[PDB]
Amino acid sequence: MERYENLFAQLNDRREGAFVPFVTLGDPGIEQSLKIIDTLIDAGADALELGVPFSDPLADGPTIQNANLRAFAAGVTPAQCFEMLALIREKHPTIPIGLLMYANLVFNNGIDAFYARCEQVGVDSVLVADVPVEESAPFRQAALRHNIAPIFICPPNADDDLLRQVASYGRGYTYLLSRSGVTGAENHHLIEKLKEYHAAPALQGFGISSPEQVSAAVRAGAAGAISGSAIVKIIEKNLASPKQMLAELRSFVSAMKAASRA
Amino acid sequence: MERYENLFAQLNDRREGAFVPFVTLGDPGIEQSLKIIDTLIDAGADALELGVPFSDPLADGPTIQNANLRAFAAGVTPAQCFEMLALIREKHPTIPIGLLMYANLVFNNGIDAFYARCEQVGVDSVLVADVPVEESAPFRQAALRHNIAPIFICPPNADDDLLRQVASYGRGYTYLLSRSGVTGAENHHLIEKLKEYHAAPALQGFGISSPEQVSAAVRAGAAGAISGSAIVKIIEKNLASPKQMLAELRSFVSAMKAASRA
Amino acid sequence: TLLNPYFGEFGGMYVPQILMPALNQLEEAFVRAQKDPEFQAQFADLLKNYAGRPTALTKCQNITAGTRTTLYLKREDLLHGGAHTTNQVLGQALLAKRMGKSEIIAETGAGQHGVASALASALLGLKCRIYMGAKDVERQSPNVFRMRLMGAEVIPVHSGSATLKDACNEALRDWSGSYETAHYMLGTAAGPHPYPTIVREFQRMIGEETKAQILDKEGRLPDAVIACVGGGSNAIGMFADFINDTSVGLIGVEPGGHGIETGEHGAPLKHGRVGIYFGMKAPMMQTADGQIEESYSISAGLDFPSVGPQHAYLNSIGRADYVSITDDEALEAFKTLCRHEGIIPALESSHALAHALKMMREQPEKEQLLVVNLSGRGDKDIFTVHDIL
Amino acid sequence: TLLNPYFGEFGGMYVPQILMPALNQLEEAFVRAQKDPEFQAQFADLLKNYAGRPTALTKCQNITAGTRTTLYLKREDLLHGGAHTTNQVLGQALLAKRMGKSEIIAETGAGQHGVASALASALLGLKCRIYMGAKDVERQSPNVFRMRLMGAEVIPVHSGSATLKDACNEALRDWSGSYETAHYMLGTAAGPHPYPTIVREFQRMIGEETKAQILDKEGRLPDAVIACVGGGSNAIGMFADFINDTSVGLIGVEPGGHGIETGEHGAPLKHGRVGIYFGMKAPMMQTADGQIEESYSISAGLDFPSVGPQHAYLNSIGRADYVSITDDEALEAFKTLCRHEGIIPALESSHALAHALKMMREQPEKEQLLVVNLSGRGDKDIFTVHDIL
Ligand SMILES: Cc1ncc(COP(=O)(O)O)c(CN[C@@H](CO)C(=O)O)c1O
Ligand SMILES: Cc1ncc(COP(=O)(O)O)c(CN[C@@H](CO)C(=O)O)c1O
Ligand SMILES: O=P(O)(O)OC[C@@H](O)CO
């Protein structure tokens, strides 16, 4: 809950947009995943979007799908995800970490029991990819009772009552979609209305891979950009030279974050 | 017509049964077919049953079917059959020759026109394998006008009116069936009734290969036995040694004819 | 005989003498059955409740676009088994049983009569042997596996062209030998009387239903009914109730094969001469010497060098007209029914269809109500039509 | 929403937010259509005159011998296309058109919904993409060729088990991206509301016809109606009109695969726990960690690790009972329907059948009137069942 308010106040303060990386927890093995996450923070990461690997990624394109399979082959479970989440909170206590989830993994152990384990480990927000606003009530009441921000998606085709509901129930940031589709590295009235309704900071989402999209987003009114596949593609690409991987990752993040001045 | 009366009078005379071989005209080539026919007459043949090769032998088992194909490969037509029929009548003017036919070949050139070519060449009888008694009228009126004996089959399942019709319309000999089926080399009230009705000499037909069947037949009341496949099988068997073929054929016929004393 | 075996000069009983009482037994059986109300009643029950009848009459939505032609199809493809074949076979198995018989011999070319002969033998409990030519066994194999799983035996005839002629031959050769125990379930309205009359009577529901149906939908009778002709059963099942309504033309479609002019076709009735084979006097394809000729068609159920006698007669007096369709024209009408109407027809029925399209697209402003007998489905054909790429 | 999305705790709309207005558009479209007399009228015309309906209710002559069981079958195998599948798809393509849509995405496992999606798109003129798992593409290939000849595109999903789950996934992934132009023609009474209600309503003619038919033949309602359950459509089409007649039990049959105890099966509703996937809250087969599990069945149309929600609810309140059948028990009922009744059933429908035989032969003196929904034909299956030798 608060680490976001913190970040958005200090960012508004030094007048810049936010830069939030995405990585799947455990790809391409736990040991190198933790180092990728430290190098991402090192190079420029304002907050973190993290994935817990699901079997059936309903809203994900192929880079993330293969990432999930690399994780699964490395033997990563939901429990290894929570135990590595506490080790990186143990050394980076400022950074907002948000979890991007699928509903079966939240629901599995008891919904409320999920939120409690998040709280316990140091997690700030939970985005459940497949629970629409009209189904959120069990999930949003249980994250509020455990002081985890409920993140909701605002789609390009959103209407009056939906922007109102997302503004009321959301916290942390409003996940603002770029396009229709599933997560892939390829190809204003809403931001205005969201602010009119007092919806928390619009971070823009699918398909940013280019720095000029970041600048563009911030310039448009988006409090930052989220980039996912773009980053995972460098993990995939450099799986054979870990050194060069961490090195190319660094470079990518600092450039991407540099683009956030506006 | 008469060569039969002749044969049956002289056979009744010297008290013996008749022995009628079968061969397909032209198998396994015209030249060797004519020599087989002379050797058959040589060895003991009382009369001759000859086949003109048809494409679709409806009442024939495999020996005769393959015989037909050997003939067809030797290039034998209905015209080559008639021209070889006159060459063997030209040197054996006593012997009754009967033609065993299928209706399409009779019907093709005009039914009456067929009978005339038979007469012209020296043929005694025509057996049409697929025209039952109730369909015979065109065929039996045209063979009578050209003095060719109409041969009819008497089947094991023949009744009152059928033995009457076969007795009335038939001439030459009554073809008496041994069994149901098609021509293959494998496995009294009727003879009595036929004679009561005054049907010409019952020659017994399908499946004789053994001399004791000949003796048996004659003893039963049959004026002779017809053997077909049995003979063709020796043509098939010895196609490679023509000498030994003519030699094994001879032997077969004399034995078969020896069996006719009764 | 109690019934006439000739349709003008065509017809007859050109069999070996030994099979004649058997044909005579059957004609009696047929006449008895047709008056037996208890026979009629259960022929009906199995047609309705087991085969799935009345079959539907479908109006074509898309293939007639920009033409004044309305085109209905009669859907024998929706009949249990997948073809018109099944209606006749149920009556005939019932006749076989009425006569205390217990084996069934049949011959098959497209495999559809084989399959229908196995399904009725399994239902009514009769043992069943089927002859099928070795080339049709390959090009029609879906229908082979279907026969064997129902417990029928299919025997591969390799002689001759290894096609229906060659299966008819081995089928008659075995029945002469087996006629005591075994009935011969003949494939079409072809061969020896009484089979031309029995197959028609056991297939005339096809047209009695179309006449009723069209009159309900259109208030008038068709301008023409079209059907393909290999031996003649679906065509005569369709034509039969229409024959006294002189206003309704009747067209029959023979395989043009590779084109009449190549020799490679199966069009006896319009490009052969009268002959005597398979128990009848009917138009036939033969050499100059009277040797029967091998036919050709892309479709196994139409690959047959003679035609049943009543078709030969309706042609002669000018009450029905017969036309042909090439392999290529039948493939074109298959591709078009699939893609614009979502019905895969059998390549046999496509010859009838391809003529109706030719009728439509040659005179597009002609106002004409047509009906095509869609006699079967194209499931047996999909592997073959798809290696024509 | 205008209609309830929950069958007790089961159901819901567990989608990505972006697809929600689309689901909402559809529910409105459905409610409008159901009251539109002009919609009802042409849904009817195409069910009757194009699909071929009423389907028949066949009494079994031979398989019940020496038992007090009467067994009727409902013949959805005689439906244009070869399966129950076709009734729903016609209503849904009509809904797609009413809503100005022009592409159709669908997913297929047995290939039968794919084929039915291609035949209605070709008839009503809609372009059509189909996802199908790479293992089902092999073991169900007759249905593949049939789809492509009708001009549909089938796309081979190699991910995961390469089976229906994996096709559902790629199908929803594309519709999120395409929902503007494209409708998603969902395979069963499963997934997101309104699909559980639409598929049932567009399949309840199955049971409305059986109830009428049995009452005419027997003067009384069945003792039990049996149907197999992969996602749930034929079963609910069958059960739906019977639910308020408490005297009629309703049994549903899930794939027992290699045997429940091996892990290799597809029996969610009776051997899985409630989960959330594919837009619903329904029983599911999953690991201890909530990762969805791969199922198994010999039959591609039943190889699916969840079950539609209304089945989950009718089980829970105890109004329907669910049972399983092994691969081997379904092969045995296939072999027996072929050989003693001359009907090749689909391996899917054989699981329902094999339970009815088990009911009969376990208590042979029990007087019981049963009805099995013979949902499809076994034509897609004959090559596969025949390499099990
Ligand atoms: C769908 C379909 N429609 C028509 C025919 C042609 O025969 P018909 O002329 O008798 O009506 C066939 C042939 N049916 C026969 C002969 O080959 C069989 O044994 O399979 C067919 O399969
Ligand atoms: C004949 C038959 N009967 C039943 C079913 C099972 O589905 P149901 O549970 O929905 O009724 C199937 C599956 N049909 C779907 C799913 O795999 C298809 O895409 O082909 C079937 O093919
Ligand atoms: O569309 P991408 O490729 O930037 O990836 C989306 C994910 O970060 C998750 O929100």
Ligand SMILES: O=P(O)(O)OC[C@@H](O)CO
């Ligand atoms: O049965 P077969 O074998 O003696 O042959 C019959 C022929 O001779 C012709 O009548």
Ligand code: NA
């Ligand atoms: Na023909």
Ligand code: NA
């Ligand atoms: Na299932």
